[PDB]
């Protein structure tokens, strides 16, 4: 009757525990008015993008592609210094990827029209690592927890970089507390 | 250049900037330094100077009056003046219209369409709001599938 | 339980028939990836690392005429860079890639179950006609030892600037 | 009430098919899992994708270093294919070649059999430098915490 | 359990001030009816027991090490490289500088990842492994009375934990681990 | 929250006021951080 994550609040009715990472955490009751399938698809997309974002922010500080345009340890500066044509190309490619991966069903009215369409399942398994039922549940839980952790980490990284005006590793190695 | 002069090198534009800055400085001369009025007037002066400098560098053309003029004929050198802003509008307006029409049909197929129109079903309304981002292909798909345009024999009309 | 790690249960994907299978997979990579792919990768790494370690030792011992002139006496990865500039490494990579196209074809026949991992049917002298299991165990053991050895040699070179034997001589 | 963002057009009174295609379980490396024509997975499966990619890399190896190499002068000299003049095409003495498809030099990229070359190489910058987690020349986060704990008002 | 009902098990309370929680069922070695905060109700008993054994073992090794450092017994060549300081903190900093503590960290982490993590996971998934068991009895000292050895190990590890903590803080206060 | 109160919030005038206040805030903040934009910068 009561949520596991927040004992004093009641268990979210729409969260039946089937989905991985379900601890009954929905204090604001978004799941009541928004389909949990759409919510989980969005959660997985955000978590995957933030996983890649954290990895990129941490890696492109140490290893860069050749060229002055790509030579930028600070990620917010890299955003501006990287070739603008290349960034627009990445944007167009992301758009085409969304379209093809979602199979022209990219709206809240048609995304899950096919019963076979499952939340967050875009048909992406190049090496077929998810075909094992024994490890599939563990992999799903790991993916959800990784997405959540990476979302929090990416947010923290972006804003600590706004504050310190220095890369993440450089900040941690030469920390200077905030003064005005 | 079309029929006017670039605004970055116009004596009229420079004179207008000087007049605005001088008005602000005259207003500032009567306030003690560091007081909120002085800070506000200094910020106004900075904003005016930044605006004039940005307009000069934007490539805007300025007439004898010293004010920027817009060349809304289709010239690609002046697309940012009317065309690209117009494209942004058309995008947003089509978004709004498409989602509104979708919600109208959704409420039409309900138990009480009038109730759905005065007291909205905001979950479905937000669903449509989200859908509105590919309205051009969606609207054309509706048109070609024939769900957009109604037949002449199915629309009420007054007698001749 | 696992013969190598007594306190851990035997990895399921490891039945024990494969050469060098002692139930050593504490992190369970076999449960993640296809064991045929993993076996092919292990044998590939084994052979490449054995060639690399033997080449390191033999380059310390001897150097072909002309290559010394081209590389200016450089050793190991410095020789790699000098001969990349020369163009030799380009030829090696071209022909290794030519081999690796058919390597990809063979990898997919392994994944289809038609080919044993690492079996290219190359035995001109017929050494592997008396006990193939024994020779396979020997190959795998030597390849693992050679992977570790080439790691040691390359990183000793990074530490000191000296080849394997030259390091062992000075140190 | 209605649960929004269902993804089902029938819930929102939008056009939709009546029979939805079933989802087969076939995967192509560098491809996707989804409905395909018969024999598509067999003809253009993971084997096709991977072997085609290997062939593409092997063909890239000559292309990356494309150019007329000559040892007439006594040393290996590279000259762009554009230099060669072709008869029988009227005004166009110089004609498009592989460099038109792959303009590495124009962008200042030193391609090689492997993607990157000496002039254009991946840049590895050591982040640590001479810093240590604690009691080091650089003032780290742990150093800040320690100094604050031992601070004097 | 060795000396069940007297030394350990149900109905045993080392400190009668606090009532033996019902969660402590006397099935775990070292169960002497001490859990005033009732963590046993919610915690995973096997995981926490393994943690206790690990902490105790590390504390025992740390007590031995700190003691040999303060007594000044050093391995041949250790003094030349690290130094002749007897202070534990100075020794730690010097070893970190030289690289000794880094290598110890690397190998301890490798052992953790390859042995403790898989073993702990399997135990928590129901392998039946006794907490803190790795099969490390080369000398065969535990074959006679394994339960007695288990209880002795747990108690010695707890005492070593407390002793090591006390020694570190005594070194902080007076500069001497004895803190006489 | 009471379903009747939520319906009252969903009523047309409340939604119009909230949405147009949100839009006005959007435009105001856009003009606050990027003022005097008479043109699309190209
Ligand atoms: C969650 C559960 C896990 C929790 C376990 C941790 C329990 C706590 C135990 C304390 C461990 C403290 C960790 C701090 C390590 C550190 O700040 O780490 C920093 C050190 C960096 O190395 C040190 O770097 C130093 C840098 O020196 C500088 O810094 C020194 C002090 O920082 C001095 O000031 C010196 O003068 C100055 O030059 C030294 O030069 C040496 O390189 C070395 O001592 O990490 C190393 O040594 C690199 C070793 C590789 C890391 C391996 C860890 C992973 C192992 C998994 C197994 C797979 C491995 C493959
Ligand atoms: C459709 C085919 C296509 C074509 C013809 C190009 C052409 C170009 N891209 Mg690319 N690009 C494409 C698809 C394509 N792209 C796609 C699908 C993406 C998204 C995944 C990108 C993302 C992208 C970025 C982010 C950048 C480029 C850049 C470039 C330029 C590279 C110049 C050069 O000599 O690089 C030679 C270098 C290489 C071959 C190294 C390849 C490195 C990768 C990581 C491997 C060139 C105009 C760069 C640019 O505009 O520079 C001014 C740039 O920064 N592109
Ligand atoms: C009232 C009549 C009239 C009309 C209807 C137009 C219409 C147009 N003029 Mg304009 N023009 C006019 C009078 C008019 N002009 C006059 C009187 C002058 C002289 C003062 C000019 C001088 C002028 C110039 C100098 C230019 C134009 C251009 C254009 C075109 C801009 C858009 C474009 O090229 O899309 C092309 C894009 C597409 C077809 C599809 C794009 C697809 C994706 C979304 C991108 C557009 C068709 C520009 C042009 O190129 O016209 C051909 C241009 O350079 N006009
Ligand atoms: C900040 C500047 C600004 C502001 C405040 C407005 C404000 C307005 N514009 Mg807009 N407009 C602007 C810039 C601006 N415009 C620019 C730069 C352009 C040039 C591209 C236009 C072009 C434009 C058009 C073409 C129309 C408007 C209309 C309107 C009014 C109603 C919009 C509406 O109901 O949308 C909510 C959306 C709908 C109700 C859906 C239907 C209407 C939209 C506009 C259709 C968009 C897609 C469609 C395929 C476009 C075909 C255009 C073609 C026939 C020429 C509104 C007062 C409309 C008007 O005055 O109607 C009498 C109108 O039809 N504007
Ligand atoms: C981090 C601690 C540490 C450090 C800095 C050293 C350093 C050294 N030890 Mg070693 N040593 C250590 C721990 C350490 N030892 C331990 C734990 C033992 C076990 C008791 C030994 C036992 C030992 C012996 C028996 C000998 C060395 C020797 C040496 C010296 C040469 C070793 C070599 O070349 O490699 C060198 C100064 C050798 C030496 O002094 O040669 C003259 C030598 O004979 N060590
Ligand atoms: C550096 C490698 C390493 C690793 C991988 C582990 C792993 C472990 N230790 Mg630890 N431990 C280490 C070194 C290490 N230890 C050292 C050097 C000592 C001192 C000698 C100890 C002393 C020690 C004690 C005393 C105890 C542990 C415990 C544990 C276990 C619980 C922690 C856990 O699962 O966290 C994993 C993380 C989470 C569950 C979530 C938090 C995620 C964090 C923020 C990131 C973790 C980063 C990772 C550790 C970095 C290394 C990655 C690399 C190996 C690839 C686990 C098997 C406890 C236990 O229960 O043992 C059975 C315990 O009681 N350890
Ligand atoms: C004095 C404390 C002490 C005691 C009583 C024990 C007791 C035990 N340990 Mg050991 N152990 C200790 C310290 C101790 N350990 C320390 C400090 C470590 C860390 C290096 C370990 C690491 C360890 C492992 C990894 C394992 C054991 C295991 C065992 C059991 C098997 C028999 C054995 O090892 O007898 C030890 C008898 C002794 C006399 C040891 C003391 C020696 C001093 C120096 C004299 C037994 C319960 C095995 C088991 O199954 O545990 C559940 C096992 O796998 N122990
Ligand atoms: C800067 C960024 C811009 C560059 C990024 C480019 C990506 C654009 C993606 C557009 C998209 O996904 O459309 C999604 C729509 C879905 O529409 C929907 O299609 C539905 C049926 S179905 O989805 O086609 O099966 C239909 O019923 C519905 O009304 C309709 O809305 O796809 C289509 O219906 C046709 C797509 C057009 C294909 C040609 C594009 C070539 C390029
Ligand atoms: C799926 C799939 C595949 C795949 C794949 C791939 C590519 C998977 C990639 C996964 C990745 C990159 C995961 C990254 C996770 C990152 C996290 C959790 C970061 C957390 C950061 C935190 C908490 C933080 C922080 C911090 C902050 C903010 C403040 C700082 O001062 C400190 C710190 C830095 C600590 C492949 C291709 C193999 C195919 C397969 O068939 C299917
Ligand atoms: C296939 C086939 C055939 C064949 C064949 C061929 C060509 C077989 C070739 C086999 C080769 C080259 C095997 C090489 C093994 C090398 C090892 C184990 C190296 C270990 C190094 C170590 C431990 C080290 C080290 C070191 C380290 C770490 C750092 C150093 O500072 C120190 C040190 C040096 C000690 C033939 C032709 C017969 C036909 C037949 O029908 C089938
Ligand atoms: C391969 C054939 C594909 C044919 C389809 C192409 C359709 C659309 C092509 C659009 C033109 C390419 O876009 C391009 O414009 C940018 C303008 O800043 C270029 O910007 C940059 O490009 C060059 C390096 O690549 C530099 O030498 C230029 O000085 C620089 O302006 C980018 O190179 C690219 O992003």
């Amino acid at each position: 009757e009561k949520s596991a994550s927040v004992p004093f609040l009641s268990k979210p009715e729409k969260l039946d525990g089937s989905m991985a990472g379900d601890v009954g955490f929905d204090p604001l009751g978004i799941s009541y008015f928004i389909d949990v399938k759409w919510l989980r698809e969005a959660e997985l997309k955000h978590g995957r993008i933030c996983m890649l974002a954290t990895a990129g922010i941490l890696v492109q500080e140490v290893i860069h592609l050749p060229g002055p345009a790509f030579s930028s340890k600070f990620a917010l500066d890299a955003w501006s210094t990287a070739p603008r044509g290349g960034m627009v190309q990445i944007l167009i490619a992301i758009g085409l990827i969304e379209m093809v991966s979602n199979r022209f069903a990219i709206t809240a009215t048609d995304m899950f029209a096919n019963p076979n369409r499952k939340p967050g399942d875009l048909g992406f398994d190049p090496l077929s690592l998810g075909a094992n039922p024994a490890t599939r549940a563990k992999y799903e839980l790991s993916e959800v927890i990784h997405g959540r952790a990476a979302m929090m980490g990416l947010s923290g990284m972006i804003h600590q970089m706004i504050v310190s005006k220095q890369p993440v590793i450089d900040q941690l190695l030469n920390f200077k507390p905030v003064d005005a | 250049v079309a029929g006017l002069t670039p605004c970055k090198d116009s004596k009229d534009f420079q004179r207008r900037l000087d007049g605005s800055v001088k008005k602000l400085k005259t207003r500032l001369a009567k306030y003690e330094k560091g007081t909120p009025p002085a800070l506000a007037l200094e910020k106004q002066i900075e904003r005016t100077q930044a605006r004039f400098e940005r307009y000069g560098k934007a490539g805007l053309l300025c007439g004898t009056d010293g004010l920027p003029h817009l060349i809304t004929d289709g010239r690609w050198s002046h697309s940012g003046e009317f065309v690209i802003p117009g494209l942004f509008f058309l995008y947003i307006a089509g978004w709004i219209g498409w989602v509104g029409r979708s919600y109208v049909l959704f409420a039409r197929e309900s138990d009480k369409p009038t109730e759905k129109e005065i007291i909205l079903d905001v979950p479905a309304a937000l669903s449509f709001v989200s859908t509105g981002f590919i309205w051009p292909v969606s609207a054309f798909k509706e048109f070609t599938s024939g769900n957009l345009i109604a037949d002449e024999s199915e629309i009420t009309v007054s007698p001749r | 339980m696992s013969p190598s790690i007594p306190f851990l249960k035997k990895p399921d994907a490891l039945d024990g028939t494969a050469a060098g299978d002692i139930g050593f997979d504490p992190l369970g990579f076999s449960s993640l990836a296809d064991i045929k792919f993993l076996q092919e990768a292990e044998i590939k790494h084994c052979r490449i690392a054995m060639l690399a370690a033997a080449g390191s030792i033999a380059q310390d011992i001897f150097t072909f005429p002309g290559y010394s002139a081209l590389t200016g006496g450089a050793k190991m990865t410095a020789a790699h860079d000098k001969l990349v500039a020369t163009g030799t490494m380009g030829q090696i990579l071209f022909w290794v890639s030519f081999a690796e196209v058919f390597g990809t074809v063979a990898l997919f026949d392994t994944l289809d179950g038609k080919r044993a991992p690492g079996d290219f049917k190359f035995d001109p002298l017929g050494m592997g006609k008396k006990n193939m299991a024994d020779m396979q165990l020997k190959e795998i053991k030597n390849g693992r030892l050679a992977m570790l050895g080439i790691a040691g040699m390359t990183h000793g070179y990074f530490i000191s600037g000296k080849g394997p034997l030259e390091l062992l001589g000075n140190f | 009430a209605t649960v929004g963002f269902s993804g089902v057009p029938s819930d929102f009174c939008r056009p939709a098919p009546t029979a939805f295609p079933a989802e087969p379980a076939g995967m192509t490396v560098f491809g996707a899992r989804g409905p395909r024509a018969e024999g598509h997975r067999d003809k253009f499966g993971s084997r096709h994708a991977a072997v085609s990619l290997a062939c593409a890399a092997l063909l890239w190896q000559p292309i990356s270093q494309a150019g007329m190499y000559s040892i007439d002068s006594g040393s290996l000299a590279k000259k762009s294919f554009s230099e060669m003049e072709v008869p029988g095409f009227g005004d166009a003495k110089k004609v498009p070649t592989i460099e038109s498809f792959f303009p590495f030099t124009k962008n200042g990229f030193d391609a090689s059999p492997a993607l990157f070359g000496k002039d254009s190489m991946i840049v590895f910058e050591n982040p640590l430098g001479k810093c240590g987690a604690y009691a080091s020349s650089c003032h780290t986060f742990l150093d800040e915490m320690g100094d604050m704990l031992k601070a004097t008002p | 359990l060795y000396k069940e009902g007297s030394l350990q098990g149900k109905g045993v309370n080392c400190i009668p001030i606090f009532k033996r929680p019902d969660s402590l069922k006397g099935d775990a070695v070292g169960d002497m009816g001490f859990d005033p905060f009732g963590f046993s109700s919610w915690v995973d008993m096997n995981y926490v027991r393994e943690a206790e054994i690990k902490h105790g073992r590390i504390a025992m090794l740390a007590f031995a090490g700190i003691v040999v450092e303060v007594l000044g017994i050093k391995a041949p060549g250790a003094g030349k490289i690290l130094g002749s300081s007897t202070d534990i903190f100075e020794i730690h900093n010097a070893a970190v500088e030289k690289g000794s503590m880094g290598q110890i960290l690397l190998w301890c982490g490798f052992f953790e990842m390859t042995a403790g993590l898989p073993a702990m996971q399997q135990m928590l998934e129901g392998s039946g492994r006794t907490p803190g068991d790795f099969g490390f009895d080369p000398l065969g000292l535990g074959k006679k009375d394994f339960a007695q050895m288990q209880i002795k190990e747990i108690q010695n590890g707890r005492l070593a934990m407390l002793a090591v903590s006390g020694m570190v803080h005594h070194a902080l206060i007076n500069g001497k681990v004895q803190g006489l | 929250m009471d379903s009747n109160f939520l319906k009252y919030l969903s009523t047309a005038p409340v939604l119009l006021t909230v949405w147009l206040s949100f839009t006005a805030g959007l435009v105001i903040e856009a003009n606050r951080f990027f003022p005097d934009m008479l043109y699309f910068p190209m």
Side-chain angles (χ1 to χ4, degrees):
Chain A
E1 271 260 275
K2 291 295 184 179
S3 86
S5 68
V6 191
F8 51 89
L9 289 180
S10 174
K11 176 209 162 282
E13 277 215 335
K14 309 286 179 179
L15 301 185
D16 50 50
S18 65
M19 297 201 150
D22 192 338
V23 294
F25 184 60
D26 191 2
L28 273 57
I30 314 309
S31 58
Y32 293 106
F33 313 98
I34 317 299
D35 193 20
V36 73
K37 298 177 71 178
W38 183 266
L39 288 170
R40 171 50 63 100
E41 171 86 28
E43 183 182 46
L44 285 169
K45 198 165 283 177
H46 286 95
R48 293 158 175 174
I49 292 154
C50 283
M51 273 195 261
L52 294 169
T54 50
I57 292 187
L58 276 148
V59 166
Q60 77 197 34
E61 179 181 348
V62 304
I63 301 137
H64 315 70
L65 293 173
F70 298 119
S71 68
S72 292
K73 288 179 283 295
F74 193 53
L76 298 175
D77 271 348
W79 162 267
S80 306
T81 57
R84 204 65 48 86
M87 313 283 329
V88 164
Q89 287 171 79
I90 296 166
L91 210 69
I92 297 162
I94 292 165
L96 303 165
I97 286 166
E98 289 265 47
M99 146 168 96
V100 181
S101 67
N102 285 326
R103 281 186 233 172
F104 296 171
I106 56 172
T107 73
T109 48
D110 82 27
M111 174 156 297
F112 305 102
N114 200 349
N116 307 130
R117 179 67 155 92
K118 328 214 76 62
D121 191 4
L122 274 55
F124 176 82
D125 201 352
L127 314 165
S128 302
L129 311 175
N132 185 15
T135 58
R136 180 55 184 259
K138 173 183 62 166
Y139 293 169
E140 285 176 357
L141 183 61
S142 299
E143 193 193 34
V144 180
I145 301 299
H146 277 100
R148 294 164 179 185
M151 284 197 253
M152 298 269 87
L154 188 274
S155 61
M157 280 162 177
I158 294 289
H159 286 88
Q160 290 167 216
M161 278 186 345
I162 292 294
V163 172
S164 71
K165 312 180 102 186
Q166 39 180 324
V168 184
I169 307 172
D170 175 84
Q171 183 187 9
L172 270 167
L173 289 181
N174 319 337
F175 199 81
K176 332 179 183 177
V178 198
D179 272 20
Chain B
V1 315
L4 310 148
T5 86
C7 207
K8 78 211 173 206
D9 66 64
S10 178
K11 307 287 155 292
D12 308 324
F13 201 55
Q14 193 55 223
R15 166 167 38 255
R16 281 198 189 276
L17 166 57
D18 294 321
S20 294
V21 173
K22 205 177 59 44
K23 270 192 71 145
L24 290 166
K25 284 178 178 166
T26 325
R27 277 196 67 204
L28 168 60
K30 63 178 75 150
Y31 285 110
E32 294 326 318
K33 289 62 59 193
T35 59
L39 310 183
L41 284 166
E42 270 143 289
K43 281 187 177 294
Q44 286 185 59
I45 293 162
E46 277 151 32
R47 283 199 294 262
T48 303
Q49 277 155 3
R51 157 166 81 259
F52 273 84
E53 169 222 307
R54 175 155 33 68
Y55 284 8
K57 297 166 65 271
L60 292 163
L61 307 177
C62 269
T64 288
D65 49 17
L67 307 161
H69 290 181
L70 275 43
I71 312 304
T72 73
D73 50 24
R75 215 179 304 269
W76 300 98
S77 39
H78 300 94
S79 288
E81 287 175 358
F82 178 74
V83 170
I84 313 312
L87 288 171
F88 282 123
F89 183 81
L90 291 177
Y91 184 63
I92 292 170
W95 189 317
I96 301 158
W98 180 244
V99 305
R101 183 176 174 285
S102 303
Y103 186 84
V104 164
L105 308 189
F106 165 82
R108 182 181 280 182
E109 307 310 349
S110 294
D111 180 22
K112 299 178 175 179
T114 49
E115 188 277 349
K116 295 282 261 271
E117 290 200 303
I118 56 159
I119 305 144
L120 271 81
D121 208 358
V122 310
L126 293 179
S127 305
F128 293 124
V129 158
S130 277
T131 67
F133 76 106
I134 46 153
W135 73 265
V137 298
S138 303
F140 200 75
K141 250 280 158 190
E142 194 95 332
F143 167 67
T144 58
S145 68
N147 292 319
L148 182 69
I149 311 305
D151 167 25
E152 165 162 19
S153 55
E154 280 125 41
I155 311 159
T156 191
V157 289
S158 59
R160 313 313 181 200
Chain C
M1 293 279 216
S2 162
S4 42
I5 311 172
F7 60 91
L8 291 188
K9 190 47 217 153
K10 184 191 71 57
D12 50 354
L14 300 188
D15 162 75
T17 50
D21 195 345
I22 69 184
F24 174 54
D25 193 342
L27 279 296
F29 296 91
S30 59
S31 83
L32 179 84
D34 201 352
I35 195 65
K36 295 179 286 207
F37 190 98
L38 290 166
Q39 285 171 242
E40 177 85 3
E42 193 188 37
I43 296 153
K44 228 162 185 154
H45 287 71
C46 278
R47 290 158 171 168
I48 299 189
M50 299 168 27
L51 284 190
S56 288
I57 297 168
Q59 285 165 185
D60 279 353
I61 298 171
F62 172 73
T63 283
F64 286 120
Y67 281 134
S68 52
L70 298 168
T71 196
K75 327 162 52 55
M76 269 281 199
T77 77
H80 161 272
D81 302 308
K82 291 279 196 179
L83 297 161
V84 158
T86 279
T88 89
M89 303 304 307
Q91 275 280 312
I92 308 182
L93 180 51
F94 176 88
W95 284 108
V96 165
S97 310
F98 187 67
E100 279 279 65
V101 171
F102 316 110
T104 318
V105 184
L107 166 63
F108 273 93
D109 80 2
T110 315
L111 293 173
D112 294 353
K114 310 296 179 271
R115 190 180 77 96
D119 182 31
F120 293 103
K121 314 242 158 198
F122 184 70
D123 185 10
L125 308 179
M127 299 180 178
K129 306 279 147 72
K130 67 200 177 265
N131 194 354
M132 196 65 147
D134 196 52
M135 279 262 169
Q136 281 178 347
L137 191 66
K138 283 168 184 172
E139 185 188 46
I140 276 289
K141 268 174 149 185
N142 286 292
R144 293 160 177 176
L145 171 69
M147 285 189 235
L148 300 152
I150 188 64
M153 301 155 153
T154 59
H155 280 90
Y157 182 67
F158 305 151
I159 301 283
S160 69
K162 296 189 164 288
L165 303 185
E166 165 182 339
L167 183 56
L168 276 205
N170 300 284
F171 218 94
Chain D
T2 190
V3 59
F5 304 80
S6 308
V8 188
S10 62
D11 295 347
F12 300 106
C13 314
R14 294 283 298 134
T18 188
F20 290 97
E23 182 73 0
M27 185 63 185
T28 305
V29 64
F30 310 112
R33 175 219 60 182
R36 304 282 185 271
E38 297 179 2
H40 193 272
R41 298 288 173 180
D42 303 340
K43 209 173 174 183
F44 305 118
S46 289
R47 180 198 287 270
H48 163 81
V51 184
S52 301
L53 193 55
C55 291
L58 191 77
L59 287 169
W60 162 279
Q61 311 222 331
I63 287 165
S64 53
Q65 288 177 326
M68 301 197 273
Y69 292 84
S70 174
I71 65 177
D72 201 18
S73 63
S75 300
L76 197 61
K78 180 182 177 178
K79 187 176 64 174
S80 50
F81 280 111
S82 75
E83 293 337 317
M84 141 170 52
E85 319 239 350
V86 177
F89 281 76
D91 307 340
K93 296 269 177 332
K94 285 164 157 40
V95 287
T97 61
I98 189 81
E99 281 103 297
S100 316
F101 283 25
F102 309 84
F104 296 118
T105 318
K106 174 70 197 307
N107 302 278
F109 187 66
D110 187 19
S112 277
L115 182 47
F116 297 105
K118 148 143 46 53
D119 295 353
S120 296
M121 186 63 75
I122 318 106
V123 195
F124 170 76
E125 316 194 65
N126 185 40
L128 310 186
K130 295 215 316 323
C131 302
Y134 200 76
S136 46
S137 54
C138 329
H139 185 66
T140 65
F141 185 64
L142 297 162
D143 264 315
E144 187 38 305
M145 294 178 65
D147 303 7
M148 281 181 354
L149 267 50
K150 332 208 189 179
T152 281
Chain E
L1 295 189
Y2 181 67
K3 280 182 180 174
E4 152 68 71
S6 179
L7 206 155
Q8 25 173 22
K10 296 184 252 273
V12 182
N13 194 353
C14 62
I15 304 141
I17 298 176
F18 319 75
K19 35 162 193 155
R20 179 183 172 79
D22 307 274
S23 325
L24 264 50
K25 328 202 316 301
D27 62 348
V29 187
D31 182 334
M32 320 186 178
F34 179 71
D35 167 15
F37 297 150
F39 295 153
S40 38
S41 303
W42 67 278
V43 302
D44 191 333
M45 218 64 214
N46 308 359
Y47 172 88
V48 184
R49 291 169 68 188
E50 175 74 76
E52 189 183 48
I53 292 141
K54 204 182 262 176
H55 280 83
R57 284 168 184 170
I58 299 181
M60 291 196 274
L61 292 191
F63 175 83
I66 298 176
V67 168
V68 292
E69 281 162 44
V70 300
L71 292 166
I73 298 305
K74 272 154 170 133
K80 174 195 167 187
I81 310 293
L82 301 159
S84 325
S85 179
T86 65
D87 187 35
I88 63 183
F89 313 107
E90 289 254 35
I91 293 159
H92 170 286
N93 297 321
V96 166
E97 181 191 346
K98 299 316 302 187
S100 288
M101 303 271 333
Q103 279 277 299
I104 295 154
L105 179 73
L106 179 138
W107 292 114
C108 290
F110 191 71
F111 175 86
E112 285 278 69
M113 272 301 266
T114 38
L117 175 64
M120 172 251 290
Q121 278 179 344
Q122 294 185 9
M123 166 189 37
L124 298 182
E125 304 155 284
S127 66
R129 189 181 64 94
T130 76
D133 158 12
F134 295 94
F136 186 77
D137 192 20
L139 273 290
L141 296 169
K143 309 327 305 282
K144 281 76 76 206
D145 304 300
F146 185 77
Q148 195 187 151
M149 307 264 88
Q150 276 193 110
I151 177 60
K152 291 178 155 187
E153 184 195 47
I154 280 168
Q155 268 190 315
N156 280 250
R158 293 163 176 174
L159 194 50
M161 270 185 303
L162 299 152
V164 167
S165 314
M167 293 193 4
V168 162
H169 285 91
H170 307 152
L172 292 191
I173 308 150
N174 273 146
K176 300 162 281 159
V177 297
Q178 61 266 196
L180 197 162
Chain F
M1 259 174 165
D2 193 337
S3 49
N4 304 293
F5 186 60
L6 298 176
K7 261 159 84 73
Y8 162 73
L9 295 178
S10 302
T11 77
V14 182
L15 290 182
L16 186 70
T17 292
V18 172
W19 192 251
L20 290 179
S21 301
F22 176 69
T23 305
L26 293 183
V27 178
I28 288 159
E29 299 288 5
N31 274 270
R32 179 151 85 87
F33 290 95
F34 322 109
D36 313 322
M37 292 309 313
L38 185 65
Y39 62 97
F40 192 65
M42 279 197 337

